[PDB]
Design a protein around this ligand. Structure first.
Ligand SMILES: NC(=O)c1ccc[n+]([C@@H]2O[C@H](COP(=O)([O-])OP(=O)(O)OC[C@H]3O[C@@H](n4cnc5c(N)ncnc54)[C@H](OP(=O)(O)O)[C@@H]3O)[C@@H](O)[C@H]2O)c1
Ligand SMILES: CCc1nc(N)nc(N)c1-c1ccc(OCCCOc2ccc(-c3c(N)nc(N)nc3CC)cc2)cc1
Ligand SMILES: CCc1nc(N)nc(N)c1-c1ccc(OCCCOc2ccc(-c3c(N)nc(N)nc3CC)cc2)cc1
Ligand SMILES: O=c1ccn([C@H]2C[C@H](O)[C@@H](COP(=O)(O)O)O2)c(=O)[nH]1
Ligand SMILES: O=c1ccn([C@H]2C[C@H](O)[C@@H](COP(=O)(O)O)O2)c(=O)[nH]1
Lengths: 547, 551
C-alpha cells in the first residue's frame, strides 16, 4: 500500500526486441513463448538495418507530455518528499554503451532530458547537455530536483536488468519485432509474477517484417455528460444470459487486458460473445451449439497474413484444396493421394448413401466448389468426365473483370447453385465472394452461411486470404482487405473447454505469406509456390477433448 | 453575472410529450417538426393509460445520484451565495412540481420515494402538511430553498404553466424530453421551445413499450449571453493520418448539426454514419452509369424489428410500390407491365427497348425482364422462354422450401433464398443487387440477413432496408414466429456524386422516432397477402428530398 519509488517518479522502460538466430534448435518443432522476443542488439548496433515504425513509435512515447497533468504529478511528488510548491519534457536514461552507440548527430536526444548511467565515465568528459550519474540511487535524487513529466529507461541490457531487479519499472513498452537476426545482447527474462501484459496493439509491416507493440504492467505483490450516459443505460438488464453455464472467471486473463487491438481479437471476441450471449440450440449433427447470427471481420492483408497465433495451424492441406478447386476437380481421391483428408468423411459410401446418392462412386463429391467455379450450369455426370467449355467459367470471368472492368460491382464468384445442392456431397458453406478494386489494390468479401468457430473459421480465414493474394498477383494488383462475413456463427458444445483455454492466450504478431512471383496465371500455382514466414504460435489444441 | 443561475443550482426539466389529434386535416400530407410532440395532459391525468418504459426512465433520472461528484458541486454552490452549509445519510435530488400537478398525483406513492419533493402554490402553506415536504410561493423563493439544502440535482416536473415560465426566464440547463410516438386527446400542451435558446445534443435508441414507439432526447441551453492508460491510448494512436482525405471535396463544417450531437444512438444513424464514412473517407471511382461515385466495401447494419419499423425519418419515403414489388416477386412474375398498370415504375427503365437492346437481348419483348428475382425464387434452374409461359412445377421453389425449413427444421443453417443464378445472369434485364437472404430462428423469433452486392446509399438502400424488413415480417407471421432482427450486409457501398449535396442536407437532420408496421393477422400463407394487408402507423418524417436536384 505504502508508496514505491516507480509510482512517484513515473519510471518506465521501453524496448524493441527481435527473435534470435539459433542453429540446431529445429524450426520443425520450435516451441514459442514471451522470451522468443529478446534480441536488443548486435556488434554495438541494432540487430536490423532500419525498422522505421519502431523509431517513430519510440519518439512518440518518449517525447510526449501532458502539461495539464503536470500539477498532479508535482503535488504527488512534493507530498512524498515532505516538501511543497521552457517546455515540460520527459527524462530518458540510458547506459554508457547505449549512448556510445548513438551517432553524434542525434545526441543529446531532442526534446528530452538525457541522463547516462556510468561508473567509469564522468562529466568533465562531456561537451553535451547531459546529466551523468553513477548509482541508480542518484537518479531518484535527480528526479526529485528536476521538473519532468515521465522518466523512460532506454536500455542497455544491463540497465534494464537492474531497474527490473529493484522493481523500479512501473511499465514496459515492448516492441515485438517478428523477424530473426544475429544478436549479442539480450533483454532479461521477465518474471511473469511481477510483470504481466495489459495491452496489445494492431499488427503492422515496416521494412519487410511484421511487428506489434505490447505493454507490461507491474503486478501488485466540462466533466458532466457522464450522467447523460447513465440515463441512456437505464435499460441495463438483470445480469448476463450464460452467467449460469459460462463463468467470466473462466476468462481471467482475456478480461485482464485493457486494450486488445491485435486483429486476432476480431475472431476471439466473437467467440467470447457467443459463449457469454449465445443462443442454445440443436443442430443437424446433434452435438449442439451456442449460435448467434451476423458478424463481419476485417483483415488488412497489406500489413500481415491472418494465420491465428493462439493455437497452431498448418496450411498444406487448404492450399491443395484451393488448387483442387481451381483445377475444377470433384474427385476426392486426388486429395487423399496427397494425404489431405479435409473431404474424406463427405465421400464415404455411408455418407453418400445418407445424402441418397446411391449411384455415386466413393469419393465422387458431385458438383461442388471446383465444378461451380469452372462449369456453373453444366450437367454433372461423374468425376471423371471431360467438362471442357461446358458451363460458365466463373473464375476466368472474374479474373477478366478485375483486369479489364475493375470498377464493376458484379465481380462475384458463387458456389450456391440452387439446382445442384442435392447432388453435392454436401451444400457449400462459403457461399460466395465479391471483389473490389481501388488504386491498384484488391479487397475480397466472403459470405459464410455456416461458421464452425472452434475449428473451421480459422482455416477459412486463411483459405480466402491466400486466394485473395493469388487473384491479386495474377491480376498485377496488391492485396488489401480480406472481409469475412459470418451468417450462422456457432460454437459447438464440445469446443467450449478448448475455447476457454484459447481465449486466455495472448496473440503474437502475425506471419506473412509469400508467393512465387513468377506465377502469372491462376492455373499455374503449385504447393511449392507458397511460403509462410515467421509463424510464431502457442501450442496446438485438440478442439474436441474425446480423441 | 459570473456563473449562471441554472448552472450553479442544476435546474433540469423532465417531460414526456405525445402527439395531438387535430380536427379534420389529412395525416399523410401533414408537415412535422420538434413541436409535433407537445401533448402533456388531459382532464388532469396522463394522455396515455400507462407507458411503462417512460416510468422506469423518469424514476431513474430523478432518483439517480453520484455521491462522489457532489463535493465539486457543493464547493461551487456555497461559493456563489457567499456562505457555509451530517444529515439524511443518502444524498437526494430535488423534484419541483406545481399544485395542479402535485394534486393530480395519487397519494399512495407520495411523497416521491427517495426525492426531496417541493411544490408551488398560493392556496397551500407549510402548516397543513408534513415537515418532509417543502413549499414556496414564487420562483425566486426556490433558489433560496436549494442553497440552504443538501441536494444532487433539481428537476422541474412542473405543468404547462410551471414549464412555461421557468423557460421564459432562462432558468433551465437541459430538457430530458421523452417523445411518445402515438396520438391522444390533450387539453394541456408543453410550450414551443425557442431554437436560439435550446438545441438537441443527444438522441436515444428507439423502443416499444405498451404498444407505442418512443425515444428520449436531450435539449441543451445554447451559449448566447487511471489517466495512466489515457497515455497508453495516445501512444496506440501514434500512426494516424492528420487529415480526412475527402476533406478537400466534403468539409466537416458542411456537417455542423451532425457533429454537434454528443450521443447519436437512434438506429437511423447506422445508415447516416455509413454515408458520412463514405463522404469523408470513400474512394473516387467511376462506374458503368458514368456519374462516378464515392465508394467503400463491406458494412453491416442491424435493425430490431421487435422495437420499431426502420423507415428512414430524415426524408420522406413511400411504401406502396415496394410492397407491390414484393408481391410481384412472391408470385414468380417477370412481367414488367403488371407493375406499370398499377403505376409502380420501379422496373420501368430496365424494360425499355433501348435498355434491353443495350443488354444484347434483341429478341426480348419490352418489359420482359427475364429470369429475375421472382423467377429465381419460384423456378430456379428452369429454362426461361417468355414472361407469359407457364412454369407451374418447373425449377426449384426456393421460397416454398425455406418456409418448410423455418416451420419444420428451424435450426437448419441451409435456410437461404438466392437470386444470383450464374447461368441466367446475362438473360436478366439486369443482374440482381440482392444476392441472397439467409434466415435464423431462435426461441420463436426469426431474423434475416440480406447480402447486397451493390448499394446506392442515396436512393436505393432506404427502400431496400424497408423492403426486406417487411418481407421478414411476412415470413415470420406465416411461420407463427415474431420478427427479431433484419441484418443488412453491404458490399460495394456507394454515394453517387450527384447526391452529395442532398445527403449533406439530410445528414444535418435529426431522426424522429420510427413508425411501426402492422399486417393483417388472418394471413397465414405467403401467397395470400394483398396491398391492403399492410399498414404503416405513426410515420413522422422530415420533408421530401429530390436526391437528383437536377430536376
Ligand atoms: N533494441 C533496444 O531497445 C536496445 C536497448 C538498449 C541497448 N541495446 C543494445 O545493447 C548494447 C549495450 O548493451 P549493454 O547492456 O552491454 O550496455 P548498457 O547496459 O547500455 O551500458 C552499460 C554501461 O552502463 C553503466 N552502468 C550500468 N549499471 C550501472 C550502475 N548501477 N551504476 C553506474 N553505471 C552503470 C556501466 O558503465 P561503465 O562501462 O562506464 O561502468 C556499463 O559499462 C547497445 O550497443 C545496443 O545495440 C538495444
Ligand atoms: C529505436 C530503437 C528502440 N525502439 C524501442 N521501442 N525501444 C528502444 N529502447 C529502442 C532503442 C533506443 C536506443 C538504442 O541505443 C542503441 C543505439 C542503436 O540504436 C539507435 C541508433 C540511432 C538511432 C536514430 C536513427 N537511426 N535516426 C534518428 N533520426 N534518430 C535516432 C536516435 C533516436 C536510433 C537507435 C537502442 C534501442
Ligand atoms: C412518469 C411520467 C413522466 N415522464 C417524463 N418523462 N416526464 C415527466 N415529467 C413525467 C411526469 C409528468 C407529469 C407528472 O405530473 C402528474 C401527472 C402524472 O401522474 C402520475 C405520475 C406518476 C404516477 C406513478 C405511478 N403510476 N406509479 C408509481 N410507482 N409512481 C408514480 C409517481 C411518479 C401516477 C400518476 C408526473 C410525471
Ligand atoms: O469450411 C468450412 C466447412 C464446413 N464448416 C462447418 C459449419 C458447420 O458446422 C458444418 C456444415 O453444417 P451445415 O451448415 O451444412 O449444417 O461444417 C465450416 O465452418 N467451415
Ligand atoms: O434495389 C436496388 C437496385 C439497384 N441498386 C443500385 C446499385 C447500383 O447503383 C445500381 C446497379 O448497378 P450495378 O451495380 O448492377 O452496376 O443499382 C440498389 O441500391 N438497390
Amino acid at each position: 500500500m505504502m508508496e514505491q519509488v516507480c509510482d512517484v517518479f513515473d519510471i518506465y522502460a521501453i524496448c524493441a526486441c527481435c527473435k534470435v538466430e539459433s542453429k540446431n534448435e529445429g524450426k520443425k518443432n520450435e516451441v514459442f513463448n514471451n522470451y522468443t522476443f529478446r534480441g536488443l542488439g548486435n556488434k554495438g548496433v541494432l540487430p536490423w538495418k532500419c525498422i522505421s515504425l519502431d523509431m517513430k513509435y519510440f519518439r512518440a512515447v518518449t517525447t510526449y507530455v501532458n502539461e495539464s497533468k503536470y500539477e498532479k504529478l508535482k503535488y504527488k511528488r512534493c507530498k512524498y518528499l515532505n516538501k511543497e510548491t521552457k517546455k515540460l519534457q520527459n527524462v530518458v536514461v540510458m547506459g554508457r554503451t547505449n549512448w556510445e552507440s548513438i551517432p553524434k548527430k542525434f545526441k543529446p536526444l531532442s526534446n528530452r532530458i538525457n541522463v547516462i548511467l556510468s561508473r567509469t565515465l564522468k562529466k568533465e568528459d562531456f561537451d553535451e547537455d547531459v546529466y551523468i550519474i553513477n548509482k541508480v540511487e542518484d537518479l531518484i535524487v535527480l528526479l526529485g530536483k528536476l521538473n519532468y513529466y515521465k522518466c523512460f529507461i532506454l536500455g542497455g541490457s544491463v540497465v534494464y536488468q537492474e531497474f527490473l531487479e529493484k522493481k523500479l519499472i512501473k511499465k514496459i513498452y515492448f516492441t515485438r519485432i517478428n523477424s530473426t537476426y544475429e544478436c549479442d545482447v539480450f533483454f532479461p527474462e521477465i518474471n511473469e509474477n511481477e510483470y504481466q501484459i495489459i495491452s496489445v496493439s494492431d499488427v503492422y509491416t515496416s521494412n519487410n517484417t511484421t511487428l506489434d507493440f505490447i505493454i507490461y504492467k507491474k503486478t501488485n505483490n466540462d466533466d458532466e455528460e457522464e450522467d447523460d450516459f447513465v440515463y441512456f443505460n437505464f435499460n441495463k438488464e438483470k445480469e448476463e444470459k450464460n452467467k449460469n453455464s459460462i463463468h467470466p472467471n473462466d476468462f481471467q486473463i482475456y478480461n485482464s487486458l485493457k486494450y486488445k487491438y491485435h486483429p486476432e481479437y476480431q475472431y476471439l471476441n466473437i467467440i467470447y460473445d457467443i459463449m457469454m450471449n449465445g443462443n442454445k440450440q440443436s443442430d443437424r449433427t446433434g452435438v449442439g451449439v451456442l449460435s448467434k447470427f451476423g458478424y463481419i471481420m476485417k483483415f488488412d492483408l497489406s500489413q500481415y497474413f491472418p494465420l491465428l497465433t493462439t493455437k497452431k495451424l498448418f496450411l498444406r492441406g487448404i492450399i491443395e484444396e484451393l488448387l483442387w478447386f481451381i483445377r475444377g476437380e470433384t474427385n476426392g481421391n486426388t486429395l487423399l493421394n496427397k494425404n489431405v483428408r479435409i473431404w474424406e468423411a463427405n465421400g464415404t459410401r455411408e455418407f453418400l448413401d445418407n445424402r441418397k446418392l446411391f449411384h455415386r462412386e466413393v469419393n465422387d463429391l458431385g458438383p461442388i466448389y471446383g465444378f461451380q467455379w469452372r462449369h456453373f450450369g453444366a450437367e454433372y455426370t461423374n468425376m471423371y468426365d471431360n467438362y471442357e467449355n461446358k458451363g460458365v467459367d466463373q473464375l476466368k470471368n472474374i479474373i477478366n473483370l478485375i483486369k479489364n472492368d475493375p470498377t464493376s460491382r458484379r465481380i462475384l464468384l458463387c458456389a450456391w447453385n440452387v439446382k445442384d445442392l442435392d447432388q453435392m456431397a454436401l451444400p457449400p458453406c462459403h457461399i460466395l465472394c465479391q471483389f473490389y478494386v481501388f488504386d491498384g489494390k484488391l479487397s475480397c468479401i466472403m459470405y459464410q452461411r455456416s461458421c464452425d468457430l472452434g475449428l473451421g473459421v480459422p482455416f477459412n480465414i486463411a483459405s480466402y486470404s491466400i486466394f485473395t493474394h493469388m487473384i491479386a498477383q495474377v491480376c498485377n494488383l496488391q492485396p488489401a482487405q480480406f472481409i469475412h462475413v459470418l451468417g450462422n456463427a456457432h460454437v459447438y458444445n464440445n469446443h467450449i473447454d478448448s475455447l476457454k483455454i484459447q481465449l486466455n492466450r495472448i496473440p503474437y504478431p502475425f506471419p506473412t505469406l509469400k508467393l512465387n512471383p513468377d506465377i502469372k496465371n491462376i492455373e499455374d500455382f503449385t504447393i511449392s509456390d507458397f511460403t509462410i514466414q515467421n509463424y510464431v504460435h502457442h501450442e496446438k489444441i485438440s478442439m474436441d477433448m474425446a480423441a
